[model samples]
Target: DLIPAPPLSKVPLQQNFQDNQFHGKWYQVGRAGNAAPPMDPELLLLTAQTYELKEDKSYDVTAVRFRKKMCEYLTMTFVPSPQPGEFTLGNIKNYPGLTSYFVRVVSTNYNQHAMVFFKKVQQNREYFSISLLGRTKELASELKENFIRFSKSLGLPENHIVFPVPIDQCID
Candidate 1:
C-alpha cells in the first residue's frame, strides 16, 4: 500500500475565527510527504479523522482503526489551542484512548489559515499534531511552502517530509 502524505500546512480556513468558538472540529485529511521512502508503512497513521470539542478547547481525535478493525478508536484533546481558534503545542496527554491530549494552534495570519504544530509521537504513540488549516482546500503553494518550513523548524527533517503533486488520497 502507498504511504500516506501530509496535508498542506496552510489550508485556507475561515479567517472569521470569532464566528466560531475555541471549541470546533477539524479533520485530518492527509499528512506531509516524506523526502525519502519510508522503511515500512506505520501501524496506522490516522488515515482519516473526526473531532469533537471537549469541555476545554482541545479536540477529541478519532481515526480509522486498522489493527482493531473497528470504528471505535481514540479521542484526545487539542490542549494547545485552548482559547478557541488559537493554536500551540504546550502540554499534551496520551494513553490508549484515555485522558485529554493537549495541543495548540500556535499561529496563523488569519484563523482560516494557520500552521498548527503538534507535540510529536513517541514509542508508537502520538505526542504532536500538525494541521494544514483552512475551511477550504485552496491554499497557495507559496503559503504551503512557507508553512512547511515552519513545520520543519519544529524538528521535521526535509527528508522526513515531501510534497506529492498528484496526491492520491482523500484530502477533504
Candidate 2:
C-alpha cells in the first residue's frame, strides 16, 4: 500500500486559474514523495489524467493507468478552494489518499506545459505529496532541466525525483 504525504514547502499557484481552461489530458512526467515500493516513472507514464468541469463548480477527474496490458482506473471529484487553482480532492479516505488531500496548480502555459503539485495532510501533519507534471509524455531537454530546477526549488532533491521514460506503447 502507498502512504500519503503532505506538502513540505510552499509553492506558488497559478494566478486566476480557470477550471474550464485546465480541462484536457496530461501525462505524468516526474514524481517524488515519501512512500514505499518506489515506482518506475516509465510505468507511471502509462497513465493519463483528464479533468472535466462540472456545473456545481467541482471537477470530475478520470485517471487511466496502464498495467500489464490492462488499464487500472480511478475516478475522483475535486472541490475548488477560495484560492483559484487550489482544490480539495474528494473520494479518497485511506493511506495514500487522505482527508486533507488537495491539489494546486503551480503554473501552466495552457498550451504545452504545466507544473502541478499535490498535498495530503492529516491533523496538521504532512504525510506525503508529489511534484511535477507535463502535457506530454516527453519534454524537451531544456524543459526537463527547467522542471528539475523547479522541483529543486520546491525542496525536492534530484536523486529523489523519478523521471518518466518515453514508452509509445502506452500512448493512445
> Each model's C-alpha lDDT?
0.44, 0.68
Best by lDDT: 2
Give the Cα-based TM-score of candidate 1 against the true structure. Answer: 0.49
**For model 2, how does the per-residue alpha-carbon lDDT over 1-172 read when each residue is reduced to its tens digit?**
3343324355678888878888878776766654433454435454677877888878888877666777677778888988888888755563363557878888887767777777666555564545455677766778777767766665556665676564655345
Regions more than 4 Å wrong, model 2: 1-9, 36-44, 91-97, 122-125, 168-171
lDDT of 2 at 33: 55
Clashes of each: 33, 6
lDDT, candidate 1, 66-165, per-residue tens: 3333344565444434345544332444344433333345455443455554434435444444565543334577866876776565556555454323
- What's the CA RMSD of model 1 in angstroms? 8.0
TM-score of 2: 0.79
Worst 10 residues of 2 by lDDT: 1-10
lDDT of 1 at 116: 51
RMSD of each: 8.0, 3.8
